[PDB]
Every structure is written in C-alpha cells, then in structure tokens.
Amino acid sequence: FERNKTLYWGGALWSPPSNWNPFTPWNAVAGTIGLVYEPLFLYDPLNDKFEPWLAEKGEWVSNNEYVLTLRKGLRWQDGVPLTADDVVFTFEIAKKYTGISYSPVWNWLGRIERVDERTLKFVFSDPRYQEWKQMLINTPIVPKHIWENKTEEEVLQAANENPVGSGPYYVESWADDRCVFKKNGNWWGIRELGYDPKPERIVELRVLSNNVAVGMLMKGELDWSNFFLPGVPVLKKAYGIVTWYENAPYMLPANTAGIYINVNKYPLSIPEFRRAMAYAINPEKIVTRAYENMVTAANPAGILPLPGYMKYYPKEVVDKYGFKYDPEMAKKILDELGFKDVNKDGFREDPNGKPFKLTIECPYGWTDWMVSIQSIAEDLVKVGINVEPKYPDYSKYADDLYGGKFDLILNNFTTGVSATIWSYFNGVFYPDAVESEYSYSGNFGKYANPEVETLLDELNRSNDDAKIKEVVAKLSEILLKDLPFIPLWYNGAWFQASEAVWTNWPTEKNPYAVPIGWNGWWQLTGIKTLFGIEAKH
Numbered sequence: 205f206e207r208n209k210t211l212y213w214g215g216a217l218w219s220p221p222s223n224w225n226p227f228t229p230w231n232a233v234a235g236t237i238g239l240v241y242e243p244l245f246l247y248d249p250l251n252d253k254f255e256p257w258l259a260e261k262g263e264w265v266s267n268n269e270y271v272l273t274l275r276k277g278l279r280w281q282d283g284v285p286l287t288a289d290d291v292v293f294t295f296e297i298a299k300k301y302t303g304i305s306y307s308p309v310w311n312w313l314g315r316i317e318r319v320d321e322r323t324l325k326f327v328f329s330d331p332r333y334q335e336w337k338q339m340l341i342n343t344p345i346v347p348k349h350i351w352e353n354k355t356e357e358e359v360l361q362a363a364n365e366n367p368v369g370s371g372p373y374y375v376e377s378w379a380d381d382r383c384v385f386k387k388n389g390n391w392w393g394i395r396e397l398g399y400d401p402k403p404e405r406i407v408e409l410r411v412l413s414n415n416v417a418v419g420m421l422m423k424g425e426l427d428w429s430n431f432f433l434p435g436v437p438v439l440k441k442a443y444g445i446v447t448w449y450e451n452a453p454y455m456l457p458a459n460t461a462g463i464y465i466n467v468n469k470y471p472l473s474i475p476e477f478r479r480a481m482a483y484a485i486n487p488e489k490i491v492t493r494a495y496e497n498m499v500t501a502a503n504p505a506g507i508l509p510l511p512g513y514m515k516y517y518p519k520e521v522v523d524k525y526g527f528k529y530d531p532e533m534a535k536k537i538l539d540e541l542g543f544k545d546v547n548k549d550g551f552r553e554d555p556n557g558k559p560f561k562l563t564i565e566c567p568y569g570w571t572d573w574m575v576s577i578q579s580i581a582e583d584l585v586k587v588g589i590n591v592e593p594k595y596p597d598y599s600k601y602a603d604d605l606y607g608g609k610f611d612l613i614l615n616n617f618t619t620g621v622s623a624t625i626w627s628y629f630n631g632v633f634y635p636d637a638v639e640s641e642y643s644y645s646g647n648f649g650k651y652a653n654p655e656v657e658t659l660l661d662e663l664n665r666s667n668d669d670a671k672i673k674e675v676v677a678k679l680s681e682i683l684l685k686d687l688p689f690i691p692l693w694y695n696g697a698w699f700q701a702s703e704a705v706w707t708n709w710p711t712e713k714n715p716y717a718v719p720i721g722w723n724g725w726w727q728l729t730g731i732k733t734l735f736g737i738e739a740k741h
C-alpha cells in the first residue's frame with residue numbers, strides 16, 4: 205500500500221476480524237456501520253443537530269406520523285439503486301424475524317406507507333419520540349436484494365464476508381491483526397453531497413495492548429488513534445501528535461464509565477450493599493492515577509456533563525439520595541447489614557461468619573481500565589470488601605458482560621453521547637436484559653424493576669421539557685437507591701493523531717467532525733473526519 209494514500213487507524217478492533225454483519229454490531233468489525241452500511245441521519249453531538257444522510261429530509265407531520273424523504277441517486281456498492289424499498293425492508297424484516305434487536309419497534313410502529321417514489325410515512329401506534337431519534341442514526345439500511353431470502357439464522361449468525369453496503373468504503377481484505385477498507389470510487393456521496401473521502405485505503409489495526417499503539421504513533425505508523433494513550437503531553441511535545449484540545453484535558457468526554465453489578469450474586473443482591481460500595485469508591489484517585497486529569501469524575505447520577513442532558517439534571521434528587529466518596533458511610537452501612545470482620549483478617553465476612561470475595565473485571569490491554577479497576581478494588585478492600593481485579597481478553601470480557609457472567613464489571617458501552625438522555629437511562633436499566641440470556645443494550649447485571657419500565661416508557665413518549673425533567677428525576681431516584689450501575693467518571697473520547705502523512709484533523713478550534721471511529725460513533729459525525737483530512741504531500 206502506497207503509504208501516502210493510506211490511513212492507518214486503530215482503537216476499536218479488539219478481536220480478530222471475522223464478522224461484518226450489520227444486524228450484530230457487537231461482533232462486527234468497527235466501521236461496518238459507518239464505512240460500509242449507512243444510516244438515515246447523522247447526529248452532531250457538539251451542536252445537538254441532525255444531519256440528513258441517506259435521507260434528504262425527515263419530520264413529524266403530526267403526533268404519530270413521521271415522513272421520511274430519501275435522497276435521489278443513492279446506490280449500493282454493487283451498483284443496484286438504494287431506494288425506499290430498502291428502507292421499508294430494513295424495518296419490515298424485523299416483523300417476522302423477532303430475534304433482530306429492533307424487532308420490538310413493531311410494538312409501537314404500526315405501518316409504513318409509500319407516499320411516492322422516495323417518500324415514506326411512518327405511522328405509529330405509540331409514538332416513542334426519544335427512541336426514534338436513536339433509531340434514525342443507529343439503524344443501518346440494508347439491501348433488500350441481498351437479504352430478502354435469508355433465514356433468520358443467516359440474518360443473525362452469518363459472517364457476511366465482503367459486505368455489500370452503500371458506504372464510502374468496502375472491505376478489500378482482512379487478517380488476524382487488521383481489516384483493510386478500500387475506497388468506493390462510486391460512492392453516492394461524492395456526486396450527491398460533494399463529499400470525497402481522501403484515503404484510498406483505511407487500514408483498521410488491532411493490537412494486544414494500548415502500549416503497542418504508543419510506538420506506532422511515535423513512529424508515524426499509526427495515523428488515527430482511538431486508543432487510550434498515556435503520556436500525552438510528551439506525545440504532543442516530542443512527536444508532533446495532535447489532540448482535540450491543544451492543552452489539558454486534551455480529550456472530549458465520550459460516555460459514563462461505571463460498575464454494572466450482578467444482582468443475582470449474594471451479597472451484591474442487597475441494594476444497601478451496592479450503596480456501600482458506591483460510598484467506598486474514590487473516583488478522584490482514578491482521575492489522577494489512571495488519567496492524569498484527562499477525565500472528570502461523574503456526578504452520582506452519571507449524567508454526561510453536556511447542556512443537552514444537564515438541562516434535565518435532577519439536582520434535588522441528587523442532593524437527597526446521591527452518594528459520594530466517604531468510607532465512613534460505607535463502613536456504617538456494612539456494619540448495619542451485619543458484614544463484619546470477626547476473624548480480623550481485614551476482610552468482612554457475611555452475617556453467618558462466612559468469608560466471601562468478589563471479582564471486578566475489564567479487558568486485558570485496556571491499560572487505563574486495568575489501573576482503574578485496581579484502584580476500585582483497593583478502595584473496596586479499604587472498607588473490608590475482598591475484591592480482586594481480573595483481566596479477561598476482550599472477547600471473554602464481552603461475553604461476560606453481555607451474558608451477565610460477572611460479579612463487578614467496569615463498562616461504558618451504552619452510556620455514550622446521544623441525541624437523548626433516554627438512551628442513558630435505557631443503557632442502565634434496559635428491561636429486556638432480565639429474561640434474555642444475552643443483552644447487548646444495557647442492564648448487563650439484569651436488574652429488575654417494574655416501576656422503572658413504566659418510567660422509561662414515559663420518558664420515551666414525551667417531547668415536553670417539563671415532563672422530561674420530571675421523569676428523569678424519578679428514574680434518577682431509583683438509580684441512586686438501588687444502584688444496579690455505579691457511575692464513576694466520564695471516559696474520554698480518545699483521539700490522538702500523527703501528522704506524518706495526514707493533516708487538518710478536526711480540533712476544538714476547527715470542530716468539523718468528532719474524530720471517533722468506535723462502533724456507534726461514525727453516525728455521530730466520525731464519518732466526516734474522512735472528508736476533512738488532507739494528505740500532507
């Protein structure tokens with residue numbers, strides 16, 4: 205590969221490339237959604253604004269009707285026109301194939317009418333405004349002419365090698381350590397939008413540890429990093445590395461990192477025991493030791509520190525029911541529960557005098573999180589809870605997470621920047637996790653609460669700020685009381701870039717895109733990074 209025509213990117217590939225199935229983004233190579241398959245809309249989180257992508261236009265034309273207008277001249281990478289047929293199919297395939305993640309949309313979407321050649325009217329039986337916003341940016345459009353005779357088992361389990369999407373890149377090749385994306389010269393976006401991605405190839409690289417990426421970035425072997433990297437001041441000073449902010453904290457906030465708790469494991473089943481753990485943990489020690497202040501500690505509700513979310517901040521609820529770092533309070537609660545260290549080994553036993561210990565886990569190689577769960581474990585040990593950190597490889601970590609096979613688990617997959625605070629509370633409480641074996645959408649510890657479901661629906665169905673503020677407070681109160689998830693800090697939108705080959709990266713001063721290619725972020729304008737960068741030579 206001609207080096208000056210190629211973009212080396214990493215930070216999102218933590219298992220060997222083997223799946224490009226748009227229906228299973230948890231297993232698909234990052235960029236499957238974004239580079240290959242495309243959404244109806246982008247959402248710009250910096251300005252809280254939707255940007256029509258495959259759609260030309262979309263709007264609510266009544267309380268329960270949403271009219272979508274598709275652009276003309278859209279085409280699949282194989283030459284076949286992309287039309288409203290494909291959008292209808294993308295939704296209707298999940299009617300019979302209930303195993304598809306968004307099959308439940310048909311509980312509140314009633315039908316999709318064909319208005320004209322490229323216009324659809326979505327008619328809703330139950331207008332869930334908040335979740336619809338997320339569906340508009342996250343649902344990839346798939347080609348009817350390819351998927352329409354696939355069995356449900358194929359739809360859900362097929363690797364989908366050499367995926368046929370509509371996007372600006374297709375898959376050229378792949379191996380244990382990489383997926384090579386090649387530019388689609390016929391991408392509809394070039395003619396219709398005037399957007400021309402500059403890299404001829406994007407090599408998505410896999411490493412076994414963040415530490416490996418350091419030397420690659422130092423030597424200009426990596427162009428675009430979405431790895432957490434330590435020692436950023438030295439990277440910038442000595443290797444000309446660029447970041448979003450010129451100075452500290454260097455990094456945008458991306459999501460809420462916190463601990464999901466297995467509520468079916470004694471004594472993690474005890475709500476007050478989970479509250480004790482919350483009081484025990486010192487997020488500032490993580491902020492300084494793991495991140496050298498590139499992140500900030502989370503408010504107790506875990507609400508991202510962003511105007512779109514914080515206008516609903518339940519200050520009175522947090523003042524009343526919130527937790528903070530206070531080991532005295534944690535120990536008070538533990539003593540009241542009867543968890544006492546009778547045998548004087550520093551570890552509390554349960555009420556029957558039986559010793560117990562727990563694990564906390566993160567992916568191996570995620571170096572900042574390894575340090576973070578060491579810190580968390582040590583805090584818990586300081587109040588007599590025997591907790592040991594464990595570092596499964598990413599694949600085992602993910603299976604532990606999705607299947608709810610853990611004691612404590614550090615995660616941030618579902619608490620990311622979005623068009624609605626509903627996605628946060630859904631990421632925490634996702635009711636369907638309880639009776640499903642695997643959950644990919646949140647509530648990974650399978651916390652059950654019938655009251656919470658009704659409140660999520662209330663929030664979902666509202667478009668009035670006063671009502672939204674009201675429901676957010678009720679949801680936050682239950683979060684703070686039962687703590688199925690303990691919010692600790694806002695993890696960074698890790699971005700550093702080398703200018704050895706590519707320049708004009710987006711920055712605070714020139715915020716033309718959010719330069720993040722993790723799955724979920726291409727549609728949060730990560731894709732627009734590719735149109736702005738310039739080949740130095």
Ligand SMILES: OC[C@H]1O[C@@H](O[C@H]2[C@H](O)[C@H](O)[C@H](O)O[C@@H]2CO)[C@@H](O)[C@@H](O)[C@@H]1O
Binds near residue numbers: 215431572573695696
């Ligand atoms: O900071 C922890 C690691 O995050 C990784 O990116 C994650 C990201 O934080 C979130 O979990 C996401 O959407 O999945 C990503 C991986 O595909 C890497 O940046 C890694 O280097 C960090 O150690």
Ligand SMILES: [Mg+2]
Binds near residue numbers: 548549552
């Ligand atoms: Mg003891």
